[PDB]
Design a protein around this motif. Structure first.
Motif, short mmCIF file in Angstrom:
data_model
loop_
_atom_site.label_atom_id
_atom_site.label_comp_id
_atom_site.label_asym_id
_atom_site.label_seq_id
_atom_site.Cartn_x
_atom_site.Cartn_y
_atom_site.Cartn_z
N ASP A 51 -21.56 -90.31 48.02
CA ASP A 51 -22.62 -90.04 48.99
C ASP A 51 -23.35 -91.32 49.39
O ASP A 51 -23.27 -92.35 48.71
N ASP A 52 -24.03 -91.21 50.53
CA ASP A 52 -25.04 -92.16 50.96
C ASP A 52 -26.31 -91.85 50.16
O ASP A 52 -26.45 -90.76 49.61
N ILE A 53 -27.21 -92.83 50.07
CA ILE A 53 -28.56 -92.57 49.60
C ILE A 53 -29.42 -92.48 50.86
O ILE A 53 -29.39 -93.42 51.65
N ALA A 54 -30.10 -91.35 51.08
CA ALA A 54 -30.97 -91.21 52.25
C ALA A 54 -32.18 -92.14 52.09
O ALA A 54 -32.59 -92.47 50.98
N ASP A 55 -32.69 -92.63 53.21
CA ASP A 55 -33.98 -93.31 53.24
C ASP A 55 -34.96 -92.48 52.44
O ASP A 55 -35.06 -91.29 52.68
N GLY A 56 -35.65 -93.12 51.47
CA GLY A 56 -36.73 -92.49 50.74
C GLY A 56 -36.26 -91.69 49.53
O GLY A 56 -37.09 -91.14 48.79
N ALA A 57 -34.93 -91.56 49.36
CA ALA A 57 -34.35 -90.78 48.27
C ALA A 57 -34.19 -91.63 47.01
O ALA A 57 -34.14 -92.85 47.06
N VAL A 58 -34.06 -90.95 45.86
CA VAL A 58 -33.81 -91.57 44.56
C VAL A 58 -32.47 -92.32 44.56
O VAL A 58 -31.44 -91.76 44.92
N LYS A 59 -32.52 -93.59 44.16
CA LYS A 59 -31.35 -94.47 44.08
C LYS A 59 -30.66 -94.27 42.73
O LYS A 59 -31.32 -93.87 41.78
N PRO A 60 -29.34 -94.54 42.62
CA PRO A 60 -28.62 -94.47 41.35
C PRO A 60 -29.01 -95.64 40.46
O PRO A 60 -29.51 -96.65 40.95
#
Length: 93
Positions: free
Chosen positions: A26-35
């Motif tokens: 997946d992509d990480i959405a703007d503002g979402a929790v990063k891995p």
């Protein structure tokens, strides 16, 4: 020759106690929790769950489908096979 994994790549992803499972990077959405570092956000088809995994647990779909792409009793797995084969880049939000 292989590149590094990128968002959109299709795989079977291996988690402890589960069969190799149809999934995508997946992509990480703007503002979402990063891995965590060295981990990719993995979206599992069928269950629609995310987990963070490193490459050791990621098997490229084209190479691996003949081994791992077969019905399984497990919940959501067969739905997962349909999704990766038929619409692997759709929004499953």
């Amino acid at each position: 020759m292989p590149h590094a994994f990128k968002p959109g790549d299709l795989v079977f992803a291996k988690m402890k106690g589960y069969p190799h499972w149809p999934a995508r990077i997946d992509d990480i959405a703007d503002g979402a929790v990063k891995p965590p570092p060295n981990k990719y956000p993995i979206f599992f088809f069928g269950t629609h769950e995310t987990a963070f995994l490193g490459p050791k647990d990621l098997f490229p779909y084209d190479k691996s489908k003949d081994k791992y792409g077969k019905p399984n009793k497990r919940k959501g797995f067969n739905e997962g096979l349909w999704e990766i084969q038929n619409n692997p880049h759709a929004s499953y939000s």
